[PDB]
Amino acid sequence: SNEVPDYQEDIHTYLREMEVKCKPKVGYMKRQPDITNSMRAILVDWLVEVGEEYKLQNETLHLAVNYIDRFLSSMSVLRGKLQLVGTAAMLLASKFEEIYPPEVAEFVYITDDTYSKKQVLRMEHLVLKVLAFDLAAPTVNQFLTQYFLHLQPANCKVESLAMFLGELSLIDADPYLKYLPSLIAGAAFHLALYTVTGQSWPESLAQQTGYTLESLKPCLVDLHQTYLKAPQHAQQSIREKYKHSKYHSVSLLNPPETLSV
Amino acid sequence: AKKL
Amino acid sequence: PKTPKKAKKL
Amino acid sequence: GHMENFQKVEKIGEGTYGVVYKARNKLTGEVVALKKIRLDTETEGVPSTAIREISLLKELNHPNIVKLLDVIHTENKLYLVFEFLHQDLKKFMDASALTGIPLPLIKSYLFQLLQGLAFCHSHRVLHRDLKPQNLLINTEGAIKLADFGLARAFGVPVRTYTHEVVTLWYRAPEILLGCKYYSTAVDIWSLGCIFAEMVTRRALFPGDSEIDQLFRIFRTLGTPDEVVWPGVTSMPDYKPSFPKWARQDFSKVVPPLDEDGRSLLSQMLHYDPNKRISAKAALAHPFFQDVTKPVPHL
Ligand SMILES: Nc1ncnc2c1ncn2[C@@H]1O[C@H](COP(=O)(O)OP(=O)(O)O)[C@@H](O)[C@H]1O
Ligand SMILES: [Cl-]
Ligand SMILES: [Mg+2]
Ligand SMILES: [Mg+2]
């Protein structure tokens, strides 16, 4: 019994304004002396598993990643502390998003005692200070759920596949830090729709978003490659997650070989 | 439980 | 009238 | 400034979540409200309620929403520094209980509350705790939404959120009946209750338990059925044994209200959350055609 219509256009406009303001610095990893895109990929892939173990929302995962990228945009971090940043970020995202955030002792457990409770809580404080408590960031997930409304009737397989593709974008900072969440969501939605039904990004969405199919192309080219190469990627947690029936096992679907485009 |  | 507390998990 | 720069004047408040002082900045003279949050009692770090309250208040800059001036975060303590307003609407109502709040002021306050709420909803924020003690008035005729500790950023479309939210008297029927989804309509219900309460000088639905709350609503608005509220008989907490009461005429419920006021109130109290009036649509209601901004008598 959901109702969204009166303020729905305003919300989409507002989120489009805030994604610009909440965007991490695209080039930040070249300025990190000790950490790399590969370490970040390992971290995010682990957070996916943590979210599954604790039955956390997909939104919580997307927020945690936004917090991490913004923190690393202004703070140099040694490789041995990167998991501490990630853990505090996931705790904060859980507190923001979840009805039931896991307790700190559980986050300590899930790192296998790599860090103490004191450290996790001190890191929480630092992340809050560095982000100036601005935690309500737009995510690819928030844009996806709004886009899904343009399918009547809903297609649950398209939605699952779109979420899967959107989640895969979290892992690889290069290329995906270059694109805003609304644009990634648009590429993921189209690619998912096309794969499942053979249809294309709808005019209603082109109007609402201002993105033509053409303007999705560069991101779409990337996402299609990512999709094709997913079974070969060093990080596998998202594929494993989306093999489940709750996701209609969409990670087992074969990508289209070419894009009509 | 994993140390990265 | 007091603001309600989140019910305990489970 | 920082903590040594505030002089505590008086304790003005407490609530489930926080301890509030009236205080003054010793350097600039500015009077503030300090909401103190205890981390030491907290071995779970910063409370989810504070995180949401701060992050969301920082996004909401509107004349009808209380302003957060500063946040002082120490290892042991978290202070939110707010602009200070004269009093909350509960204390005003109590002081007005014998005389009544003049109709033009009631209309002004509701209009302003709707402006603040519409802004929240357009910013994807549900307040979820609207009641008179969470609303603040100044000496110039302004009223503002406050106490965002229960607030949440919501998704389009929504998913299941915390079941235990609004203070009982102000709680919407879809929550009482256990719906897995609720949204902006819950805040409109609360405001409808508060509107009626300003008019009659007493709480509209002063329930002492969840069933008593539900039955007080049914006795006033009639027991809902599939016709007024499709799906109602399938809600998790609905029972077919609920007594079936007929709806009362609003002339009995809110005698002082004119035709326009009764029309607006009935739309704010609509059973079906999908047909309940939005804050934005309410602002366009004929009731507000003559709206002014009188000064309250304090
Ligand atoms: N900015 C303010 N100016 C004046 N009084 C306030 C202000 N903020 C809160 N109060 C008073 O303190 C009480 C508790 O504050 P609130 O923020 O609602 O805390 P809680 O979440 O614990 O209920 C309020 O009901 C109000 O009467
Ligand atoms: Cl109250
Ligand atoms: Mg309060
Ligand atoms: Mg509160």
Structure tokens at D71: 């946040």
Residue of A229, A169, A161, A155 lying closest to A48 (CA atoms): A169
Provide φ and ψ at D179, rounded to 5°.
Answer: -60, 145
Query: Helices A156-171 and A213-229 meet at what angle, rounded to 10?
Result: 80
Question: Per the annotation, does D16 bind a ligand?
Answer: yes
Structure tokens at D174: 């879809």
**Separation between Cα atoms, residue D205 and residue D221, nearest integer Å:** 11
Pocket probe for ligand 1: among D10, D16, D20, the residue whose CB has the most ligand atoms within 8 Å is: D20
Residue A197: CB atoms within 10 A of its CB come to 12
> Given CA atoms D116, D118, D119, D124 in this order, what sign does their dihedral have?
positive
Pocket probe for ligand 1: among D8, D11, D12, D170, the residue whose CB has the most ligand atoms within 8 Å is: D12
Q: With 0-12 CB in 10 A as exposed, 13-18 as middle and 19+ as buried, what is D136?
A: buried
A142, A124 Cβ separation under 8 angstroms: no
What H or E segment, with its residue span, contains residue A192? helix A181-197
Provide φ and ψ at A129, rounded to 5°.
Answer: -65, -45
To the nearest whole Å, the CA of C10 is away from the closest chain D CA by 13
Q: With 0-12 CB in 10 A as exposed, 13-18 as middle and 19+ as buried, what is D154?
A: buried
Residue A207: CB atoms within 10 A of its CB come to 10
**What are the sequence ranges of the domains in chain D?**
1-86, 87-297
Q: Which residues are CB-neighbours of A21 under 8 A, at least 6 positions away?
A: none
CB contact under 8 Å between A14 and D122, yes or no, is yes
Provide φ and ψ at A237, rounded to 5°.
Answer: -65, -35
- Which one is catalytic: D40, D70, D129, D260? D129
A35, A77 Cβ separation under 8 angstroms: yes
Beta-ladder partners of D136:
D88, D144
Atom of ligand 1 nearest to the CA of D82: 1
Ligand 1 surroundings by CB, under 6 angstroms: C 3; D 12-18, 20, 33, 35, 66, 82-85, 88, 133-134, 136, 146-147, 149
Three-state SS annotation for A77-126: CCHHHHHHHHHHHHHHHHHHHCCCCCCHHHHHHHCCCCCCHHHHHHHHHH
Cα–Cα distance list, A188 to A173, A195, A199, A226 (Å): 16, 10, 13, 11
Structure tokens at D122: 């357009």
- Helices H, strands E: what count in chain D? 9, 10
**Separation between Cα atoms, residue A45 and residue A10, nearest integer Å:** 34
Provide φ and ψ at D79, rounded to 5°.
Answer: -110, 125
Same fold, D1-86 and D87-297: no
Q: With 0-12 CB in 10 A as exposed, 13-18 as middle and 19+ as buried, what is B1?
A: exposed
Provide φ and ψ at D36, rounded to 5°.
Answer: -100, 130
To the nearest whole Å, the CA of D159 is away from the closest chain A CA by 8
Question: Per the annotation, does D13 bind a ligand?
Answer: yes
Structure tokens at A134: 């601005």
Resolution of the PDB structure in angstroms:
1.9
Secondary structure (3-state) at A135: coil
**Separation between Cα atoms, residue A134 and residue A130, nearest integer Å:** 9
CB contact under 8 Å between B4 and A110, yes or no, is no
**Separation between Cα atoms, residue A71 and residue A85, nearest integer Å:** 8
Beta-ladder partners of D13:
D20
Length of chain B: 4
Q: For D87-297, give the CATH class.
A: mainly alpha
D157, A149 Cβ separation under 8 angstroms: yes
Chain C / chain D CB contacts < 8 angstroms: 29
Cα–Cα distance list, D142 to A115, D64, D132 (Å): 50, 7, 14
CA A72 to chain centre: 16
Q: With 0-12 CB in 10 A as exposed, 13-18 as middle and 19+ as buried, what is D30?
A: middle
Q: Residue D279: what residue type?
A: A
What is the 8-class DSSP label of residue D172? -
Neighbours of chain B (3+ CB pairs under 8 A): A
What H or E segment, with its residue span, contains residue D72? strand D68-73
Q: Which residues are CB-neighbours of D149 under 8 A, at least 6 positions away?
A: C3, D15, D17, D18, D49, D50, D52, D53, D129
Q: What is the CA radius of gyration of chain A?
A: 18
Structure tokens at A66: 């936004």
Query: Long-range contact list for D67-70, CB < 8 A, 24+ apart?
Result: D69/D32
D35, D80 Cβ separation under 8 angstroms: yes
Cα–Cα distance list, D110 to D131, D200, D201 (Å): 12, 14, 15
CA angle (D165 as vertex; A2, D212 as ends), nearest 5: 100
Neighbours of chain D (3+ CB pairs under 8 A): A, C
Q: Which residue segments constitute the domains of chain A, with CATH numbers given?
A: 10-23+137-261 (1.10.472.10), 24-136 (1.10.472.10)
Question: Per the annotation, does D164 bind a ligand?
Answer: no
| Dihedral-angle region of residue A152 (phi above 0 means left; psi in -120 to 50 means alpha; beta otherwise) | beta
A104, A117 Cβ separation under 8 angstroms: yes
**Separation between Cα atoms, residue A79 and residue A73, nearest integer Å:** 15
**Separation between Cα atoms, residue A94 and residue A107, nearest integer Å:** 11
A51, A60 Cβ separation under 8 angstroms: yes
Q: How far apart are the first and last CA of chain B?
A: 10
- Helices H, strands E: what count in chain B? 0, 0
Chain B residues with beta carbon closer than 8 angstroms to that of A42: 4
D53-91: buried (b, 16+ CB within 10 Å) or exposed (e) per residue?
bbbbbebbebebbbebeebebeeeebbbbbbbbebbbbe
Residue of D61, D76, D198 lying closest to D125 (CA atoms): D61
Q: C1 C-alpha vs ligand 3 centroid, how far in Å? A: 10
Cα–Cα distance list, A254 to D10, D91, D243 (Å): 67, 65, 56
**Separation between Cα atoms, residue D47 and residue A126, nearest integer Å:** 15
Atom of ligand 1 nearest to the CA of D86: 4
D157: cis peptide before it, omega within 30°? Answer: yes
Residue of B nearest to A54 (CA): B1
What is the 8-class DSSP label of residue D99? T
Half-sphere exposure at residue A246, Cβ-oriented, CA atoms within 13 angstroms: 5
Which residue, chain included where needed, has tokens 């917090």? A67
**Separation between Cα atoms, residue A127 and residue A117, nearest integer Å:** 15
> Given CA atoms D112, D114, D117, D119 in this order, what sign does their dihedral have?
negative
- Residue range D1-86 in CATH 3.30.200.20: yes
Residue of D49, D51, D60, D57 lying closest to D123 (CA atoms): D60
Residue of A nearest to D123 (CA): A11
Q: Which residues are CB-neighbours of D74 under 8 A, at least 6 positions away?
A: D3, D39
- Residue D129 designated active-site: yes
Length of chain A: 261
Residue of A121, A81, A86 lying closest to A104 (CA atoms): A121
Question: Per the annotation, does D69 bind a ligand?
Answer: no
Q: Strands D68-73 and D19-25: what pairing?
A: unpaired
Atom of ligand 1 nearest to the CA of D133: 25
**Separation between Cα atoms, residue A160 and residue D30, nearest integer Å:** 53
Q: Which residues are CB-neighbours of C5 under 8 A, at least 6 positions away?
A: D16, D164
Cα–Cα distance list, D48 to A91, A186, A199, D55 (Å): 10, 31, 42, 11
Beta-ladder partners of D80:
D35, D71
**Separation between Cα atoms, residue A93 and residue A86, nearest integer Å:** 10
A145, A189 Cβ separation under 8 angstroms: no
A37, A174 Cβ separation under 8 angstroms: yes
DSSP assignment string, A197-260: HS----HHHHHHH---HHHHHHHHHHHHHHHHHGGGSS--HHHHHTTSGGGTTGGGSPPPSS--
